[PDB]
């Protein structure tokens, strides 16, 4: 199914995922598309930072839901 | 100077700060105003998560700049 | 009538309500004022969590009553 | 170490615990001392609900800390 991930800088991308995918799995797909390693990503749904080991289902993220993405860098 | 801190869920608060305030200082101010514990706060500007030991001036955060606020639970 | 909804981190929200308002109506007022999604809200009176579908009058909540608010975020 | 568990009706109990105790272990001690079943207990520290599987040291809960206890039961 499709979900959207919107950066805080206004860029939207479309990902193909399954309810069973972990947040770690979703970050790997984002790297596949955008080149950002998972450790430098923080994903956000309903105002909360999500945990690598929980699933989209855990968070009730469904078809065409929008997550937000921010970078987590050191020094910048 | 005044800055705006916005959650992704529609709440805006205004804070009085100085350019030399650290992000740690700013989270303490948000705790004072809104009650949110500092370890559960993640502040965002320029599409990225901010670090506790840097100042507002370090990130070029100026008067009337908007920061975003998201929550992080986990061990916090 | 007015009621007060206190968090466990020392903040107080004042709400205008009616005795016939449901717990869900109260959560929608809190979403309007504070941005908190109703799905994350748990309202408390007399030390216990309150249920969707009941009215304020069903719990003997009256003018100037104080409720508590705690958050429960799906999946942490 | 000693900790306090306080309900929102002001009922306070003290418990003897170790930093390595899980939140579930704490709920079990509460059941032993006060006869509240663990399923009915929501334990809160720093405004956030605590996960059953995590330890007191995971949350940096130190000697003489106060946890709040909210009761969850349908029908009242």
From Swiss-Prot, chains A, B, C, D:
(Microbial infection) ADP-ribosylthreonine-modified residues are where?
Answer: 66
Covalent cross-link site, Glycyl lysine isopeptide (Lys-Gly) (interchain with G-Cter in ubiquitin)? 6, 11, 27, 29, 33, 48, 63
Which residues are annotated as modified residue ADP-ribosylglycine in the UniProt record?
A: 76
Q: Where does the Ubiquitin-like domain start and stop, copy by copy?
A: 1-76
Q: Signal sequence span per UniProt?
A: none
Q: What does this protein do?
A: Exists either covalently attached to another protein, or free (unanchored). When covalently bound, it is conjugated to target proteins via an isopeptide bond either as a monomer (monoubiquitin), a polymer linked via different Lys residues of the ubiquitin (polyubiquitin chains) or a linear polymer linked via the initiator Met of the ubiquitin (linear polyubiquitin chains).
- Record protein name field: Ubiquitin
Q: Which organism is it from?
A: Homo sapiens (Human)
Q: Which gene encodes it?
A: UBC
Residue window of the full protein shown: 1 to 76 of 685
